[PDB]
Each structure stands twice: as C-alpha cells, then as structure tokens.
C-alpha cells in the first residue's frame, strides 16, 4: 500500500513491447523529442530557415 516510484532518467526513447516487459525509462510514443543525456528529455532543436 502507498507504493511510490520515481525515475530520474527517461532517456530510453519509446518501446513497442508490452508494458509488462518495458523498461522504466521507455515511453510509448515520443514525437519531436530529444533524449539528451545529462539534461533530460528536451524538445527537438528548432528548424532554422
């Protein structure tokens, strides 16, 4: 009861495996994201004309 968890590094991208087998640092859908290391998940760099 009152179980809690926290993940300090979600830089693992996405994973199509069933969530039972998914690693804690893997999402289900990541679009326009940059899984930078040492700075966490970031929005992808802007597109300069």
Rounded distance between C-alpha atoms, residue 42 and residue 20, angstroms: 26
Tell me, in Å, the resolution of the deposited structure: 3.2
For residue 33, what are its two tokens? 């994201």
DSSP of 4-42, one letter per residue? ----S---S-B--S-TTT--TT-BS---SEEEETTTEEE
Strand partners, 40: 36
Using only the alpha carbons of the chain, give its radius of gyration: 14
Any bridge partners for residue 27, and if so which? 14
Sequence-ordered list of residues with C-beta below 8 angstroms from that of 42, at least 6 positions apart, any chain: 33, 34, 35, 36
Helix (H) or strand (E) holding 43: strand 40-43
By the 8 A CB rule, do 12 and 23 touch?
yes
Distance CA 31, CA 24 (A): 18
Question: What's the residue count for the chain?
Answer: 49
């Amino acid at each position: 009861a009152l179980i809690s968890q926290s993940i300090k590094n979600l830089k693992g991208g996405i994973s199509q495996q069933p969530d039972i087998l998914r690693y804690p640092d893997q999402g289900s859908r990541q679009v326009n994201g940059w899984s930078s290391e040492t700075e966490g998940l970031q929005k992808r760099p802007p597109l300069v004309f």
